[PDB]
């Protein structure tokens, strides 16, 4: 195992200081999130994930579904990811354009979208190469943090909850259904989850409310949604809230067929 190698030295310091969780805990969280997202526990392979999913959002890249932008995604997070990479590489005036230049990618920021001129073969080929680039891993995590993790950690701390299971479950919810906005988002679900000060009770309630909307086709293909939340709820029932020394348990709860 040795979860630490799945990150980078600087990334672990960042995650520990801002989320209070360590390498093993984040590694376990990622296994649980990657199962319903890519049906693959080997999540580090997705640092270099790049693909045009023909959904009019440009290219989908990385671990958390960031896109480069398209007619149907005019507020993508991809530009932020690239700017973060430029920053991680030391740019004093970091920018998505600076990042593309460093990478030798023929593309530019057009408005709030990234306009890529290279073919998918060329573009994604370059992204694939970044899988073990420490700066790319750092940029990936910083962006994942700004888009979904920060808010999830804030919601947990507001309620006096700091467990790995709670944070991981909130993050899975935000990533899959959105952080804020409608009743189906992390924000919306929390508003309907009660006010129990007992972490286990609260999470059992939260998971029950999430199960009602998780299988709506737009979020997951049934019964994948029900199964993804079941993973977290099971850990709560087993009392494995700290997500440390749970390799066999994780192997057991992710043992389910997608679709």
UniProtKB/Swiss-Prot annotation:
Localization (cell):
Secreted
Which CDD domains does the protein's record reference?
chitosanase_GH46
Q: Where does the record place the catalytic residues? A: 37 (proton donor), 55 (nucleophile)
Which GO molecular function annotation, any one, does this entry have?
A: chitosanase activity
**Family statement:** Belongs to the glycosyl hydrolase 46 family.
Source organism per entry reads Niallia circulans
Recorded protein name is Chitosanase
Q: What is the first-listed, main subcellular location in coarse terms?
A: secreted
Catalytic activity of the protein = Endohydrolysis of beta-(1->4)-linkages between D-glucosamine residues in a partly acetylated chitosan
* Classification of source organism: Bacteria, Bacillati, Bacillota, Bacilli, Bacillales
A GO CC annotation recorded here is:
extracellular region
Gene3D superfamilies per UniProt? Chitosanase, subunit A, domain 1, Chitosanase, subunit A, domain 2
Name a Pfam family for this protein: Glyco_hydro_46
Q: Look up the EC number in the record and give it.
A: 3.2.1.132
- GO annotation (BP), single: carbohydrate metabolic process
Function of the molecule: Aids in the defense against invading fungal pathogens by degrading their cell wall chitosan.
Q: Please name the InterPro entries in this protein's record.
A: Glyco_hydro_46 (IPR000400), Glyco_hydro_46_N (IPR023099), Lysozyme-like_dom_sf (IPR023346)
Q: Which residues form a coiled coil?
A: none
* Sorted UniProt keywords: Disulfide bond, Glycosidase, Hydrolase, Secreted, Signal
């Amino acid at each position: 195992a040795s979860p630490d190698d799945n990150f980078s030295p600087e990334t672990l310091q960042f995650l520990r200081n801002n989320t209070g969780l360590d390498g093993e805990q984040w590694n376990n969280i990622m296994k649980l999130i990657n199962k319903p997202e890519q049906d693959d526990l080997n999540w580090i392979k997705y640092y270099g994930y790049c693909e045009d999913i023909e959904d009019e959002r440009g290219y989908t890249i990385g671990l958390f579904g960031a896109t480069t932008g398209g007619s149907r995604d005019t507020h993508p997070d991809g530009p932020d990811l690239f700017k973060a990479y430029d920053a991680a590489k030391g740019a004093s005036n970091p920018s998505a354009d600076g990042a593309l230049k460093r990478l030798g990618i023929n593309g530019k920021m057009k408005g709030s979208i990234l306009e890529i001129k290279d073919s998918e073969k060329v573009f994604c080929g370059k992204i694939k190469k970044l899988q073990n680039d420490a700066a790319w891993r750092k940029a990936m995590w910083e962006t994942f943090y700004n888009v979904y993790i920060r808010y999830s950690v804030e919601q947990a701390r507001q309620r006096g909850f700091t467990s790995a299971v709670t944070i991981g479950s909130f993050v899975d919810t935000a990533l899959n259904q959105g952080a804020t906005g409608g009743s189906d988002t992390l924000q919306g679900l929390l508003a309907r989850s009660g006010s129990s000060s007992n972490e286990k009770t609260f999470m059992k309630n939260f998971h029950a409310k999430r199960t009602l909307v998780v299988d709506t086709n737009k979020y997951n293909k049934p019964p994948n949604g029900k199964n993804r939340v079941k993973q977290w709820d099971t850990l709560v029932d087993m009392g494995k809230m700290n997500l440390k020394n749970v390799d066999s348990e994780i192997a057991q709860v992710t043992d389910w067929e997608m679709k």
